[PDB]
Paper text:
Outer surface protein C (OspC) plays a pivotal role in mediating tick-to-host transmission and infectivity of the Lyme disease spirochete, Borreliella burgdorferi. OspC is a helical-rich homodimer that interacts with tick salivary proteins, as well as components of the mammalian immune system. OspC consists of four long α-helices, two shorter α-helices (4 and 5), and two short antiparallel β-strands located between α1 and α2 (23, 24). The biologically functional molecule is a dimer (with monomers referred to here as OspC-OspC′) that assumes a knob-shaped structure anchored via an N-terminal lipidated moiety in the spirochete’s outer membrane.
To elucidate the structural basis for B5 IgG’s specificity for OspCA, we solved the crystal structures of recombinant OspCB and OspCK at 1.5-Å and 1.9-Å resolution, respectively, in the P21 space group. OspCB and OspCK each formed homodimers nearly identical to those of OspCA (unbound or bound to B5). Specifically, OspCB and OspCK monomers each consisted of four long α-helices, two shorter α-helices (4 and 5), and a two-stranded β-sheet. The monomeric form of OspCA (with or without B5 Fab bound) was structurally more similar to OspCK than OspCB, with an RMSD of ~0.7 Å for all atoms. By ELISA, B5 IgG reacted with OspCA but had no detectable reactivity with either OspCB or OspCK. Superpositioning the B5-OspCA complex onto OspCB and OspCK revealed additional structural attributes that likely account for B5’s inability to recognize OspCB and OspCK. In OspCB and OspCK, Glu-175 is superposed with OspCA Gly-174. The bulkier and negatively charged Glu-175 side would be expected to clash (sterically and electrostatically) with Trp-100, thereby impeding B5 interaction. In the case of OspCK, divergent primary amino acid sequences at consequential residues further contributed to a lack of B5 recognition. For example, OspCA Lys161 forms a π-cation interaction with B5 Trp-100, which cannot occur in the case of OspCK due to an Ile residue at this position.
Author numbering:
A (entry chain B): 42 to 116, 118 to 196
B (entry chain A): 42 to 115, 118 to 197
The structure:
């Protein structure tokens, strides 16, 4: 019974650490679905302001660089393959954004190009969003396995 | 007792839900410290691109509203700590809206963006002071939630 408390707390530490990565991905999705081409509006809400998404994409870039860092701190023989798959997907996403600097690494990034980078429901998603979509799937799979380990401990 | 396990899972759900809010705040701090006045750089990293922070602030505004929603989703022990954080989250959102003249444009200067979301900014008079209070209210809420989970696991 002394082993169970040690097993529950340490497996919950993985669930908490994975939740951090899940939420970082959700914040990118929130920037993509709500903030692209927008500006703060008088009396609340967002108003349309097309084509100046350069600093917003720098923010998604920085969060992608936080996501791989969190994946590096994860270390479990059962989750080794699922963790390493998420880390490769997180690096691919960051590298794809870097490769599209000609269109994404400017101030006046168009709404279309910003969506192609970070909006996973974008039709073309050929400037990073397809890599972001794989990163979502890899992290969701890692979360499901971690949540099952905590349920088996309890 | 088998009933204790019900206490562990339900109190761990609170820890997970608060961690989600903490991470949303960390993403805003990551936008503030790294992305303001920046753009994606060829070969990696971020390059200087002053101003044009308007859509980045729209993203911080959107994440601030997600934080308020998550605080609404939250335990008769933590009611005052939850209500205090919810009040701080609404104050932060309302402060950003009130500064729409300087924050609700395309070409938001680096200085004004930092006054809004960079809690280490010296002036911090366009929202960052409210953000700093929100950080403190959430970290105090997190400490209380993890203390309740530690009492359950023993």
């Amino acid at each position: 019974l002394t082993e169970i408390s040690k097993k529950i707390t340490e497996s919950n530490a993985v669930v908490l650490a994975v939740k951090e990565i899940e939420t970082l991905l959700a914040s990118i999705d929130e920037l993509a679905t709500k903030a692209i081409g927008k500006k703060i509006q008088q009396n609340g809400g967002l108003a349309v302001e097309a084509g100046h998404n350069g600093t917003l994409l720098a923010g998604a870039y920085t969060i992608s660089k936080l996501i791989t860092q969190k994946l590096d701190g994860l270390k479990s023989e059962k989750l080794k393959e699922k963790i390493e798959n998420a880390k490769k997907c997180s690096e691919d996403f960051t590298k794809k954004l870097e490769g599209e600097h000609a269109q994404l690494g400017i101030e006046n990034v168009t709404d279309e190009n910003a969506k192609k980078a970070i909006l996973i429901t974008d039709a073309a998603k050929d400037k990073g969003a397809a890599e972001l979509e794989k990163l979502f799937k890899a992290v969701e799979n890692l979360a499901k396995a971690a949540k099952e380990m905590l349920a088996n401990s309890v």
